[PDB]
RNA sequence: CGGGCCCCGAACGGCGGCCCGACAAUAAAAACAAAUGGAGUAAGAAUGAUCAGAA
């Protein structure tokens, strides 16, 4: 109901890891690949292991058109 | 009305496989310059690539294969004439300039570079004897419009993930300097950025699916044209054709008539 | 809800393109491809999903 | 719930131009179409769906009573 | 509870790994995690200052970190 | 809920430790706390406000407690 | 003109006739050479007289080596 | 300045000057007068123009 | 000096001749002159603009006037 | 001298919602809060200083009557 | 004029201006003067009085 | 008094011979270096000694920090 | 009055400041901040009740390797917050950097490597120098008023060391340095409490291993008070005790005006 | 006819004397295809240990 849309997405995302360009509300541009994520938490992996909450992201760009 | 026509062929023959004559026989334009002929004149003789109401132009290479470039006009030029004295130049003919009355056009076609060390070398050759010879054409009254593939990016906003070909062959950096100095210091513009200073356009990405598919283009060909012109740009446009050409069309107006 | 699912439906059966403004007042205008309760993709360069919570303003191309 | 819903009937049925201001502070213009549980959809020459999440404060221009 | 984000927490706890919060606003918190409960967290410093989940943007581990 | 958020505030109250509250909007708040709740908390100070703990970003004490 | 180093380079270009190579701000150039100038406007002399402003004259290039 | 000897020479011979602007855009007619602040060509509808905004004033004929 | 541009705007204004004042960057501006001043020329559109000298190119009256 | 102060201190005790279009053509808008022999100050969410030889026309958007 | 931008040199606001060409030019007042203003943004990147268009400060003074 | 702040740093570039490059009003980036400059006018030494005047000049990137 | 003194002392190795007392002369000393440079030992030594001053908060971070680094500080009243490391591996991976914050000042401890053992301790020199640099001029613009107090291993001007035509060559007056001092001084507008006070030449902080040259006084003048200009006018006075050497460093002591508070 | 020169009033005007208006001479240039669009275009600093702003 509530992830029937966002979940398979990032599943997808996640899979095929493709390089992400996360910006967080702050407008801050953080970069990375998705390596793990549930319901309240993402766990994006880089040079520095990062746990970015959901509830300050505004958008995931992703570097190509998941389908 | 004042149209001009870059389509970098890349061998005139696949063009016409592809379906390029009929598409520029439909495009009503006032010059053609496709390049990269990769066919004698002898070939291109042949009157399936003359198109109606258009003369035919065309100066090939001493081996077909290595390039050869044509020139289409709809109206009779005062004066053709082909190769600059270099021997990169004239051996290949890789360059073919037509007069028409206060303007003269050219059809310029860049070694890609991309092949091997020598073909990087060739290009820095003719980068620097081309420069020079424009050196010697600034005084100039003729303007002119040297329509051709460059083979090099100005600016980020020309290409993408530039991160990752600064080091690959078309954006390092003198041959990205040598065009800033061609275009800035000698008062030369460019139609399509003066017109419209936007991103994501390009002209040749690889025949690669993947790279059609995530746009991985990178901009080669240019509008070169002396600042008389420049005032007289209307708009520019780089149609996304569907794999008729590696170097996309790049058709561009201006507001400048033509005249025998 | 009764109001956003029906004309957030027909803001894309009728190809509009939206325009929606971040809280920190940036500005992107896409076609939207999916909506959620909590995420909504707009169409830009590349899937650029954005989440509702963080949506400010949605200014309609018409 | 007992002092949103008069007021922002109220406010519809008058058609008070209201001037809704955004947490950032922008002072946004128009007329109010039809509100909603969570969201408002005000109109200023076209639609345009404002969030409640991002509203900070409505200022009517014109003083109304409650019902 | 949670699938990943309590374990994380946990195992932050555990090596008590030199943590750096970052605020949603730009600011950056100092200090290890002393502990942790659903929206509260304790960071040890040279004061026990509380910092709150909800204001939390970005916990980077100074050391790479596996759950 | 609240395993940890409670003990720590009835302490800090018990003890009228002066703690120094930062809001997410970046203004200096100053007072001790004299009371609480699941949302809004009395303060201390002259003017004694009730601030609002979905604005509240950290608090942090003039001396640590237990 | 307190310094006034646009004096002596128009005074040597004009003197020696050299052909120069004004350029505007609009982008058209304009070749000839400087017949004689003042505050405001320079006489370049090509077939006929060209009034062109001072506050519309770009850069200045001239197609000759001047020493000085 | 040599400007007011140019004009005033245009203007008592009449020559028909093209006249370019700083936009660029190139005007046609003669000088019927002119001032340190104005020209009040002498075209068909004697188009005013300040003198902060020329480029070139050329004669058609030497 | 600035002797000839007050009479030819002055007559301008008194018949009240439609001119178009073509700016610099190419945009009309068809009106009437409502009045004139240093820096400043007052236009008789339906909001009355006031324009600036330095930006104007030419004025140019639909009707040849006479001086 | 006679014209632009009257009117701009007019526009100003008005506060009428002036809008303003520079020499290249861009269109600003918001309220004259001081004039100035040089430049002017224009305040639109951001108070920005837009500079008197940069202003092709001052478009007000309401009727204005000089004194 | 001189008020304005003293102010917003002293207290080191984020200005970005935009020139008469439509550059978006972005750094810090480093010092003015009638007919110049040094911009401090990585290199001394002056800028002439003239061409200035409109100056954006990141928040009011 | 009208180039306090120009003056001094236009000399510093001078004596200094920083590649400067000069972007006019039209857009035309000018690298070069700063052979003299006055009131108005400042002397770019290149392949072509070139005079670009002041009232043009948008502005000047100095390649390395002065 | 309000006044308080900071101290700062680049022992180069816990154990021997320790051997020589050095201890008794800090505990006797009275003063506000203790920034002990160089500590080449674990953080766990610094936590011993030996090193640690009775009375005084603590706090120390060294590097990979206990004996090639680290700083420690010594805080008479507990501050609002501590941070360490600077983003740079230089300096995080070294313990080069450690920060107290406190109000407006937060003493900072600053170690520049010497680049006198080799060349890749040069060129670690010049990398931390860019990267600082570059951060401080991205820094410059921030409301809160720092104090780098740190010992920079670079003599500024002439009058902090004599015979300056052999030390052209030697590390302290090499030219790249001396420039980049003089930049993050002048052109940042950044000032020395030392060099404001007082113009007085012949003191000096560092010295060779010779005894011939400190009978002689050929020192060199390694530490500056690297303070925002928002500090530089509450400056009153500094001394420079030429006690017997405890290291390759000597006490810098500083007073102000501002009276801190937690 | 109108440009360059000196002469003279009170950074600012202008008048007489004149000269020239085809350079008493480039040790040389791998080459001079020929000497009004117009009512207005502005997508995101890999993160100040913490910013109250007035007649």
Redesign the pocket.
């Given at each position: 109901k509530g992830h029937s849309l966002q979940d398979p997405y990032l599943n997808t995302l996640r899979k095929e890891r493709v390089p992400v360009?996360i910006?967080?509300?702050?407008?801050?541009?953080?970069?990375?690949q998705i390596e793990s994520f549930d319901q309240f938490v993402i766990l994006?992996k880089?040079?520095?292991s990062?746990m970015?909450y959901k509830h300050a992201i505004?958008?995931v760009?992703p570097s190509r058109p998941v389908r | 009305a004042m149209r001009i026509i870059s389509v970098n062929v890349n061998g005139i023959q696949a063009a016409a496989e592809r379906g390029l004559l009929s598409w520029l026989q439909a495009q009503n334009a006032d010059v053609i310059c496709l390049q990269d002929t990769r066919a004698s004149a002898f070939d291109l003789d042949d009157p399936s690539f003359q198109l109606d109401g258009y003369f035919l132009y065309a100066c090939d290479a001493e081996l077909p294969e290595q390039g050869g470039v044509a020139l289409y006009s709809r109206l009779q030029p005062?004066?053709?004439?082909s190769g600059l004295?270099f021997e990169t130049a004239d051996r290949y003919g890789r360059y073919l300039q037509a007069?028409f009355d206060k303007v003269?056009i050219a059809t310029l076609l860049l070694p890609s570079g991309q092949s091997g060390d020598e073909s990087l070398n060739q290009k820095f050759k003719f980068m620097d004897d081309f420069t020079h010879?424009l050196s010697?054409?600034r005084?100039?009254?003729?303007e002119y419009i040297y329509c051709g593939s460059l083979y090099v990016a100005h600016q980020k906003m020309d290409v993408k993930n530039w991160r990752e070909c600064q080091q690959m062959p078309g954006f390092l950096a003198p041959e990205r300097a040598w065009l800033d100095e061609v275009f800035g210091n000698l008062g030369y513009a460019d139609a399509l950025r003066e017109?419209?200073?936007?991103?994501d356009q390009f002209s040749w990405w690889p025949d690669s699916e993947q790279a059609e598919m995530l746009n991985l283009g990178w901009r080669f060909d240019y509008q070169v044209l002396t600042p008389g012109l420049r005032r007289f740009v209307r708009?520019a446009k780089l149609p996304r054709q569907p794999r008729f050409s590696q170097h996309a069309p790049l058709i561009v107006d201006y507001?400048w008539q033509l005249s025998i």
């Open positions: 360009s910006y967080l509300v702050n407008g801050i541009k953080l970069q990375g994006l880089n040079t520095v990062q970015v505004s958008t760009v | 005062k004066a053709v004439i004295g007069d003269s010879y010697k054409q005084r100039k009254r003729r017109v419209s200073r936007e991103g708009n507001d």
